Amino acid sequence: DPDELARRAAQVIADRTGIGEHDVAVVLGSGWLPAVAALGSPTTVLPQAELPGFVPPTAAGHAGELLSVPIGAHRVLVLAGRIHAYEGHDLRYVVHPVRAARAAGAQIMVLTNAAGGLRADLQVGQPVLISDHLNLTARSPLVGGEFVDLTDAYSPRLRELARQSDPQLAEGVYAGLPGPHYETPAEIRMLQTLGADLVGMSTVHETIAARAAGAEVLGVSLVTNLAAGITGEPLSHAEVLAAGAASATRMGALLADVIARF
Amino acid sequence: DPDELARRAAQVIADRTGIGEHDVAVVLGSGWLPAVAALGSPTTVLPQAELPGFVPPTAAGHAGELLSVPIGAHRVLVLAGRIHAYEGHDLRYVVHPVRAARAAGAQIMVLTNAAGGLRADLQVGQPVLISDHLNLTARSPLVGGEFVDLTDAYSPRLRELARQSDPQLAEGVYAGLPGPHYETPAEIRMLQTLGADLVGMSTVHETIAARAAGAEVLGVSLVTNLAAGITGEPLSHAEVLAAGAASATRMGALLADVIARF
Amino acid sequence: DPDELARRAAQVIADRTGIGEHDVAVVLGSGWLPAVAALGSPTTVLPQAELPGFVPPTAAGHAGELLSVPIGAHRVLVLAGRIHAYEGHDLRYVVHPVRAARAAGAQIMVLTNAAGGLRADLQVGQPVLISDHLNLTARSPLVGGEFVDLTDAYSPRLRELARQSDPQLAEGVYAGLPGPHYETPAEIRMLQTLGADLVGMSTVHETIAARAAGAEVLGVSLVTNLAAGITGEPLSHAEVLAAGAASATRMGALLADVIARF
Ligand SMILES: O=c1[nH]cnc2c(Sc3ccc(Br)cc3/C=C/P(=O)(O)O)c[nH]c12
Ligand SMILES: O=c1[nH]cnc2c(Sc3ccc(Br)cc3/C=C/P(=O)(O)O)c[nH]c12
Ligand SMILES: O=c1[nH]cnc2c(Sc3ccc(Br)cc3/C=C/P(=O)(O)O)c[nH]c12
């Protein structure tokens, strides 16, 4: 039962953090993990693997940390590490962190991800607010007749507040793909035709699960590379894996300023 | 084996109905089920639960009935309550009623559904004939080298006959998506680019099964809402259900009149 | 571990062919099997069934044979028949042959398929070079964080070599669908907009697995039919077979001539 696992998780978070309510939660992608220190000083740090439902029975142990960070007036639940669909787990395990955070009081979910830019005007190292998504995974985290509206899934309100922090923040449509292979240049030309500005391998299921629970979502991509076929050179996975470190302080500063305005 | 289970269902169906052969079958969508009464009144009701292959043995009280109804010269199997792909069961369960109906003698399947309207001419409460479909589920109900042609899958002949009942009927391409979440606005703009006029969460697998089994198909959508981002307004799931209820009489009367013409 | 089973298949291929290393591998799909004779005189032939990890190919014509063929300065591993995703197999089994080929030395993978032509200038019986692919299966054969760049997935070098053998050879973008149903005319019109020239039900996962394992790929489609709705008539799936036989000694001699140039 996702609801039951989510409440058992929230209880242990409340115990281990001695805080009964975290009103904001941030999921950090690979691209945003470097920024963790620049968010603020945490009051508690525990292994995600010690939390009910975080470690998919499939196998392995989540390599990720949960952090409790005071930012402005807010008490922030920071999830440093996420599970991806491309690891082969049921989506229940992929969106569990979002549901656990909701059951722990989260009103707002900041979902960060790495992405390829598809739009001429995007640069490597640029943070881009997510205006909307294309779920191209042919899956949903919802089972049975759980009908949810995905109008304004990325709160226009939270994007206004983000732009009060930095009026030059660009907006884009994020295409969520299964991965883990990068796209062919032909797949990228297809995604351009379908209205995509950004391409990644996360987020869309977390957004659906967050909206189904009634939480507000802010989505932020880090453009870690231009998308396949755009440069005329191949994608370097080394340049991509290292992209977050080139932007850590700038990204951490941005998240901390924007969360303070919620 | 699906085909085996469909033949045994058809044997039980002929025994329990006293009817050796049902020449037509209707799958009632969510937005059509309330129109069961205006089709005619049945000679037999059957609990799906008591029929070979209909209900996964571990299932929630989905209820579901198979009715035997006379309409003009026709003995019509009416499926009241279908298994959607978003319940998460094998597609063999989703298409079993079409295969069972075929084995029972149905050479015409009337496939009904609820749909979001993408085309500017379409309004809430409008029945629309299906001219063709986009299968955006990345699935097929067919396994191995069952290779089947979907040219004229929605019989032009049957759309002709429908239009003798109501000559004003529009027609449109239906996109079947997994669901159960509704589309983001950006997903709808994508489906417009791809050539969809209607969007729903069923029908496409049933059509493929029907054509593979050698039955003609008439598809009918009730437009229960404008698709996401067609207005500036979010989708209401309650107004989608209201449109179902509100269209009941007109939709049952339409099907009844169309089926007498076959 | 797919990689252990691939190694162990390569050791058994080596011991039963008495050939330590094959530098080139050819996957012959549906309607290429006729061309196997004209590739050259095999040194050895084995049943694919005798090899660890190989599922018996069950499709039309598919022999389940392995042939060790000398062609120019190359020792060619010819897989006469493949496993399709539409048979319901985990992709680890679909791409196992490509991985085994690679563990036995394959530097180059020649992947052939049947395809429908979406450009009406293409002729039944025409071989078309694959320039790029659209993976429309919503799947990957890679599991966990296996990040692979698919820029130049279909080696430009190898297509230039093929055009040296036959300068008239067309190239096109292959849309890989799940199958096994053929597409609606609406779906074909959708695939044109997504930038596809060819449509089939194989190859894309084999290509990803080959690039993942460090092999170069040449893709060659045989146009067996014009795609649904391109001509007003339906598709004939006994005339899809007739293209395969008509294109035997032509195809087989083209492949032998192209590999000699590698
Ligand atoms: O061009 C692109 N295509 C498709 N996807 C991408 C990503 S997404 C990514 C790339 C590398 C690592 Br490691 C992890 C992830 C997921 C990250 P997450 O932040 O969403 O968890 C970045 N660039 C592209
Ligand atoms: O905008 C839209 N997007 C996607 N799907 C839809 C449907 S489909 C539906 C809506 C409510 C209930 Br309850 C069930 C279903 C499935 C119904 P079925 O009729 O095919 O069985 C109506 N409108 C939309
Ligand atoms: O118009 C078309 N649409 C989609 N696909 C095709 C194929 S290819 C094919 C069609 C049906 C079955 Br069943 C199997 C295969 C693949 C065999 P392969 O091993 O060569 O890939 C030929 N024409 C079309």
Residue numbers in the entry:
A (entry chain A), B (entry chain C), C (entry chain B): 7 to 268
Question: What does the article say, verbatim?
Answer:
Purine nucleoside phosphorylases (PNPs, EC 2.4.2.1) are cytosolic enzymes involved in the purine salvage pathway metabolism in most organisms. The enzyme degrades (2′-deoxy)nucleosides based on 6-oxopurines to the corresponding purine bases and (2-deoxy)ribose-1-phosphate. Purine nucleoside phosphorylase (PNP) is a well-known molecular target with potential therapeutic applications in the treatment of T-cell malignancies and/or bacterial/parasitic infections. The results are supported by a crystallographic study of eight enzyme-inhibitor complexes and by ADMET profiling in vitro and in vivo.
To obtain information on the binding pose and interacting residues, crystal structures of recombinant MtPNP in complex with inhibitors 18c, 45b, and 45q were determined and refined to high resolution. Inhibitors 18c, 45b, and 45q bind to the active site of MtPNP through eight direct and three water-mediated hydrogen bonds. Compounds 45b and 45q have different substitutions at the central phenyl moiety. Substitution by bromine at position C4 leads to changes in the orientation of the phenyl moiety as well as the shift of helix (same as in human PNP) to avoid sterically clashing with a side chain of His243. These structural changes do not affect inhibitor affinity toward MtPNP since the IC50 values for each inhibitor are similar, leading to a conclusion that the active site is flexible and the movement of the helix allows the protein to accommodate inhibitors with different substitutions at positions C4 and C5 of the central phenyl moiety. Crystals of MtPNP in complex with 45b and 45q were obtained using the EasyXtal 15-Well Tool, hanging drop plates with reservoir volumes of 500 μL and 2 μL drops with protein:reservoir ratio 1:1. Crystals of MtPNP/45q were obtained using the reservoir containing 25 mM magnesium chloride, 100 mM TRIS pH 7.5, and 25% w/v PEG4000. Plate crystal dimensions 400 × 150 × 10 μm grew in 3 weeks.
